[PDB]
C-alpha cells in the first residue's frame, strides 16, 4: 500500500497552515528549510514615529522543519511545476543559500513569503 502521510524532499515548496492564514519555505533535506521572516509597522505604531519608536525588516533564514511550522500545519505543494520548466534542484537549494542573510522591507510587502520561495525556482538563471 501507499504512506498514510506525506514527506518532503529536497527542492519541495512546504505550504503551512496557521491560524486564520496561510506561509510557505523551501525545504533543503536533512530535516531543514529556507524561509522568509515575515516584518511589521513598528517605524509607524499607533500614536509614534520614527524618533519614538524603532524600525524592523524581513530577513531570508535557515531553520528546522518543526521548529519553523510549530504548532502549524503543513504540506508539500509544488505547484510552479505547471508554471516553469524542470530546473536542477542543487542550483534551487544553491539559490536558497544564497538569499538566506538578505533582508526585504516592513509591512507593505504584503504576501510575500511564496514570492520569495516562487524566485528561487523561477530565476534559477
Not at 504540506?75 to 538569499?99: C, G, T
Request: charged content about 20%.
Amino acid at each position: 500500500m501507499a504512506s498514510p502521510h506525506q514527506e518532503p524532499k529536497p527542492g519541495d515548496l512546504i505550504e503551512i497552515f496557521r491560524l486564520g492564514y496561510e506561509h510557505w519555505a523551501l525545504y533543503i533535506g536533512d530535516g531543514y528549510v529556507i524561509h522568509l521572516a515575515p516584518p511589521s509597522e513598528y517605524p509607524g505604531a499607533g500614536s509614534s514615529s520614527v524618533f519614538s519608536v524603532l524600525s524592523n525588516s524581513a530577513e531570508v533564514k535557515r531553520e528546522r522543519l518543526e521548529d519553523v511550522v510549530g504548532g502549524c500545519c503543513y504540506r508539500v505543494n509544488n505547484s510552479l511545476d505547471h508554471e516553469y520548466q524542470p530546473r536542477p534542484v542543487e542550483v534551487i537549494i544553491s539559490s536558497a543559500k544564497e538569499m538566506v542573510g538578505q533582508k526585504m522591507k516592513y509591512s507593505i510587502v504584503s504576501r510575500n513569503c511564496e514570492h520569495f520561495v516562487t524566485q528561487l525556482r523561477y530565476g534559477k538563471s
